[PDB]
């Protein structure tokens, strides 16, 4: 039973809870009972970025990156409805939580890739006929990926979308057209996909843990440049509860 | 320009009756407002919630109306949210909560009236500066 003073500064605060190796049980689902995920935690351990080949006909791979924004990456205190569907599948509907983190990773050679690592508005479902959550249960779903910067964000020349200059004021008589993409800010909103593979189950406490892989676009600097494809891998913890 | 009896004449109630404050009353009002209110309301704004200011138009659209002496005295006794829906004495200085807001303890009825008068007169002097915030400094 660790206190804040036990944990502060250690890096444990950015880690999701684990389950003992004994946690290989089954958590029964009463189809007449409503359920909630009281806490969903996602701890990323690897950020992969898809390289962008030159011939545009090559098989592009996801390459490793170096995290440079430190232990600030985990999503936690996420809660939401856990619906029991007609076909016996379960569906988690994310309601709220600390469900995003800006992350910057660096590619070989130095290119930095910011992204909003997130499961905002996650809807994720299991296979049909889940009478018990077990080590064979998986969740698959989609989430929203809003702009990495929100609407008030001003670039270094003070241009922005919901605020800021709408032109390059330091170039008073330059031609506008060439600068359009930099002058007119755009707010991206795209989709991401995620799988959760349950590896451990405490059927008594309703706790589950496992691994996840998510895929989503990175920052596009409010429309100034193309986003990169990102694959995030890590571990997750969830506490299931009768609602 | 001068601080005339006309400047110092403000609405007493919602029914169109006015009251004319003395210069001593005006000074007492500024003093008491600085004493018990300016820490949050300096210049007619509200530091812990800038959405609500002390402009007369704002007070007039409040519920119940707060753009007169009776409204402001009542507010200093039993403050409400802007729609009048919640009583907020527990988080806003008032006579009702003088136990947890101790500077309210030595405030008399006369004092509340002076403060009210200050809040109503000051925009007649300062115009848009009152409730304007830094834009109008």
């Amino acid at each position: 039973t660790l206190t804040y003073d036990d944990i502060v500064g250690t890096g444990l605060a950015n880690k999701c809870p684990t389950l003992d190796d004994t946690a290989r049980g089954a958590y029964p689902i009463d189809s007449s009972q409503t359920y909630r995920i009281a806490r969903l935690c996602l701890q990323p351990t690897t950020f992969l970025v898809k390289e962008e080949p030159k011939n545009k006909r090559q098989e592009a791979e996801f390459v490793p990156t170096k995290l440079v924004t430190r232990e600030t990456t985990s999503l936690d205190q996420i809660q939401g409805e856990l619906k029991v569907n007609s076909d016996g599948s379960l569906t988690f509907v994310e309601e709220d939580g600390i469900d995003f983190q800006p992350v910057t990773v660096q590619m070989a050679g130095g290119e930095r890739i910011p992204l909003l690592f997130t499961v905002k508005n996650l809807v994720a479902s299991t296979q049909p006929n889940v009478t018990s959550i077990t080590t064979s249960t998986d969740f698959k779903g989609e989430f929203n990926v809003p702009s990495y910067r929100t609407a008030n964000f001003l670039d270094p020349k003070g241009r922005g979308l919901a605020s800021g200059y709408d032109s390059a004021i330091a170039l008073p008589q330059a031609k506008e057209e060439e600068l359009a993409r930099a002058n007119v800010k755009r707010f991206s909103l795209t989709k991401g996909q995620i799988s959760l593979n349950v590896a451990k189950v405490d059927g008594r406490t309703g706790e589950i843990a496992g691994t996840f892989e998510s895929e989503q676009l990175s920052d596009d600097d409010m429309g100034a440049h193309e986003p990169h494809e990102v694959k995030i891998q890590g571990v997750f913890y969830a506490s299931i509860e009768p609602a | 320009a001068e601080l005339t009896p006309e400047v110092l004449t403000v609405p007493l109630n919602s029914e169109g009756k006015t009251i004319t404050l003395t210069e001593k009353q005006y000074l007492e009002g500024k003093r008491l407002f600085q004493y018990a209110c300016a820490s949050c309301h300096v210049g007619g704004i509200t530091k812990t919630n800038p959405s609500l200011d002390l402009r007369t138009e704002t007070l007039a659209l409040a519920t119940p109306p707060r753009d007169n002496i009776e409204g402001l005295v009542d507010y200093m006794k039993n403050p409400t949210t802007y729609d009048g829906e919640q009583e907020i004495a527990e988080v806003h200085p008032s006579l009702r909560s003088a136990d947890i807001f101790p500077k309210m303890r030595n405030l008399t009825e006369k004092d509340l009236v002076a403060i009210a008068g200050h809040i109503l007169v000051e925009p007649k002097i300062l115009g848009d500066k009152w409730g304007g915030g830094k834009v109008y400094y």
Binding site: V63, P64, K66, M107, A108, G109, G110 | -
Partner: protein, 56 residues
């Protein structure tokens, strides 16, 4: 138009401290003897030879 880079590669210096390699790999640790390390080494050597020149 690279001239000394191939001579470094020829004898086994193929990686950068920044993580890339000339064979196109990623996430490699070249150790100190990256291209940058080799360069640094030569600069320092230069400095020391300069001082020795003064003394002699």
């Amino acid at each position: 138009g690279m001239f000394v880079l191939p001579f470094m590669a020829r004898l086994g210096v193929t990686g950068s401290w920044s993580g890339w390699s000339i064979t196109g790999e990623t996430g490699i640790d070249p150790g100190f003897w990256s291209f940058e390390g080799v360069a640094l080494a030569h600069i320092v050597l230069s400095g020391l030879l300069f001082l020795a020149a003064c003394w002699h």
